[model samples]
Target: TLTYDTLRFAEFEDFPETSEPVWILGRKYSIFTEKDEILSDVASRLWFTYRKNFPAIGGTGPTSDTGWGCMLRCGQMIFAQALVCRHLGRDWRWTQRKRQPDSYFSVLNAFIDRKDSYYSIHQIAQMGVGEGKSIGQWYGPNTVAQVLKKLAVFDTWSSLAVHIAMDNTVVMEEIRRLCRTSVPCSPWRPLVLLIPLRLGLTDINEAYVETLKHCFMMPQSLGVIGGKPNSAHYFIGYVGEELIYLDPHTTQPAVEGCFIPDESFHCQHPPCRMSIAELDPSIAVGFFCKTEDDFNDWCQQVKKLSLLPMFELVEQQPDVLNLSLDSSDVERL
Candidate 1:
């Protein structure tokens, strides 16, 4: 019988830490440092802000159906979290301006299912044989990267750092090559790899374990496994034998405007635990960088942009609305 562990997922502390940078494919990637500690704080704040402000119909939005849009939901989480990390310790506010560069929240929401990106989804469908039957339908994870690129979230080249390498072998090979080469500008830079699993990999549990090892070696790296078009969870950490997550499908009372729970309750929402086999049948695996060098390089460039002033020093947006995903809206796809 498959056993389940419901322990509170303060699991990051359990993983072994490395004092020196990890060398992957010869590329020196940094560990979770003081910088990432701050980034994590900012990232979670931004995530809750987005969830509180923008509830959706049947998507990853705070008030929408949680099950149908894992890819879109998880993609948005990674993007928003990364954006906050780039502007560490800065304040953010919502803007109504249609084209304002410093309008952080505006751009973020627009990227998700807004006309700005939905139109592009149509074009994407034309290229693919059966992406969807009509507009406003569930889209794939790769589209998230494409939409961000079109918006020039950071800029053209910087956005390339986030790609949709569908070939899983190419991803592993790229990781290996990155371990070898010292080249400055290549396609590989802490990839957010969104691909399906290879056929011959008989042991699915082993794959999840190895992937977790990669994340430990390269902190602040983000990943998603299984849910190509179905339910997926944002990878939190892997400790002992439990794989932890931030499951969008979960609806915590604290998120419903009740008193925020203690650390024990935090695990009810995030750090949701599962076994390797539980994650094995999944498709659409993704990767993200939390503490990679390329990400910091881009963050520095972002600081020089005209929009920097708006985010330089700001307070957290107050929680005016207590929102939760209603059960009526959530269902398995």
Candidate 2:
């Protein structure tokens, strides 16, 4: 009954004209070159698809993540977005060119399918053991969020402060000092933050829909990381009632190094869309604060959000109820 013959058979979909400004990762682009500009922003994001035929983990492990790694790939895109923002800035767009910056390749290389590539599937799945999940198992938004928090620690290339808030509680002072370094004065890189939330129990709670819309409205956001109750998507923006996102459901050959540079890594098709009300209640939202002032501004904005407050923003860290991840923590696809 929910078949889009046009959307199913076609590779591209035109962004519909909207009276309300169409928001994409914090920027309003109802009119975009002005349509080309909108897609450029979408493609500019490091799209991490389901990769197959790569090295094995744990000596003789599964090599391809074709069937069950969508959620893991979703998290990789979230981390990839932060890396791109940290190294190449969000304004950077993708196109075929012989000449390119070295930093671009460095960022791309880190995501290749290898055990040592920092944020690769090998690493993501391998790190699963420490967090109560085994390799080759399904990953949830929370699993990937926690995994990425650790993955960022080893990469000194971009000194990012990772904040993984728990129980929908974000302490402003807790994150302020986390990013503010005591160095004489070098100007550290921005904060890469992830806040995991529960929108409803089994299905999306309608009460939070308006507040979820504001997550797309924030300037410092990396959008949200959640999908249809069972799957995952890296949501970039939204129109009136649809959620616009990048799908990690496509299976492509894995590239080690310099596999044509970037055309393979960047998504070229029109991003996928679905009804916003269909999102799973258990999800995670992320943001990239490139500077200290940016985070301070975020604190002010979240505090100002009263109509449908996204989460609890405490001035100081209040002792909280501890949480776990047995049946309530993650899911399999």
Candidate 3:
């Protein structure tokens, strides 16, 4: 139906031959030297896609989300990225047939296509009802983010502190309250801060391109949750002017039960690449802070950017109360 749809189904090749540095969720790789390592990092992160024949969400909803679940799957991949960072750390790589950690399996179990899994599609779809999104409906960056914040409340094991900054602003005290709120020696709740912003009315404003690329270079960066016009993708990092992403456009059989096997979740294909200028104006940038100081450092690092800032860092929420990012993008399946 769209150019975006056709591109994902098309074939792509290996890492480029240029010496340009490749950034994948903070770690840097050189196409000239660490090409194999680059692919490994990309494959290690979970890739959620459209699934068919899964248990109907809420037991009676659509069994296939082929038409309208692209953003929801994007949400799952980003959320899953946070889980992997929380339990397994960034260095851990996923290898087929080789034994992995229980934490790894636990992370997979958390989002299987089931009603009881804490952050499964069933829960996300059902939770959207309260957010004014019906089951099988489309979700904008901020809408899926709203559902994620609410869902994290039920996830005690990770105890992740999920925060969505309102009105293109990151309030300092607000995040400290969410992440810290504990003794100095104790660990912070580990924040997953998602900032939803619109860089233009339709096409992205070229002015913000430099700042957008800088985001992937940050150590705290968790990539982004946005893609081409209508299709949603998980933006992992960038090489030169192109962004490396994992597309959720593919259709796969749902692993309905606890497990027949895996490897499907790990994308072994060479990373998908697209020009950053092609990014939609409606997008959300994400970051993971494992400690309070880490959050503080991000604020400091973000403020130093010279280009047009995509969003701002404020000492606290502005008194006038500007509204949060709006989503007219949702639609019924």
Candidate 4:
């Protein structure tokens, strides 16, 4: 079977390891600012939570086996921030750690814990067949998105196929349908815009730039990038000509109680910034919106920009999109 180490770092070959922080002349930078403080805070929390709970294959090992969990980890980061936004307006004590229904970590835990109403990555991966041999194994972007939607509405997993292979057009259609149908029904609903890149045709840098602008417009918005050849990463912010992100695959924790140059994350991973040209063109992006209004507005703005093409329209009727999977091709953990 193909091993995690063998297939890791597909999307980040140029990034130096934490032991050696090599900042590429023009391509190297960091953009952790007030705009990205919320994201950084939540990301740090998620990182610590995952590391504390999962640890490593061998006890106290340096790195956790999160190779397959990039997408889900990205979701956790985005969803956690969205939860904070939900309670931000109603609760003045929102900044406090685990306060009651409105606390950030408390709300986020509900989604990550299997006992709670939300589904964890392990539970989501266990939905289909021949994939995710173990809860720690890898899955696809489309599968994760479908599972996220199902969990949001409290749907169960299915062994049958759900969700087809997704492209940029397919993701946009799903976002449009989700916004149109779900917004009017639930005002506090969290809607995400799934934007997948079109392999060689799509311009990832441009898409990311637009995504950053959207975040600035809607500071409460939470975004993630997936179509990277291997791991999905969380989008932090943009500065100069770089896109800063948080890598969930690393075992590093965000430095506690330090605010200089942004909350410094003490990890072995490299500085999470790359020139726009360095971003992989094949990656997919997800922007999590706290409310229907934000979702709908982003949809309208995306349409107006006309930056990308539309793919075949898929209905949101099924909780899971079923695509054909050859049993022989399925990997074992």
Name the candidate that leads on lDDT. 3
lDDT of each model, Cα atoms only?
0.37, 0.77, 0.82, 0.42
Q: How close is candidate 2 to the true structure, as a TM-score?
A: 0.88
Model 2 score (lDDT):
0.77
Better of 1 and 3 by TM-score: 3
In TM-score terms, candidate 4 sits at: 0.56
Q: Quick one: ranking by lDDT, best first? A: 3, 2, 4, 1
142-238, model 1: which lDDT tens digit per residue?
4544544334334432333444444333333444343223555533443343344431222243424554344423333444434435455555444
- Cα deviation in Å at residue 66, candidate 2? 1.3
Compare candidates 1 and 2 on TM-score and give the better one. 2
Tens-digit lDDT track of model 4 for 1-333: 124342235364333323321121111223222323333243343331233233233333323334556666666554544444454431223222433342443454444434333645444545523343455555455556556555555532211111223533445445554444334434333554554443233343353454443432333334445546445666655445555566665432322111122222222233366566666554435554555566556556555545543223333422332222233323310
After superposing candidate 1 on the true structure, give the runs of residues whose Cα lies further than 4 Å from its correct spot: 1-67, 89-136, 139-161, 169-208, 250-270, 283-333
Deviation of model 4 at 262, angstroms = 18
Off by over 4 Å in 3: 1-8, 185-187, 228-230, 257-260, 306-308, 318-333
**Residue 290 C-alpha lDDT in model 1:** 33
> Of 1 and 2, which scores higher on lDDT?
2
The parts of candidate 4 lying over 4 Å away from their true place are: 1-64, 89-102, 111-117, 128-134, 155-167, 170-188, 199-220, 227-230, 252-271, 289-292, 307-333
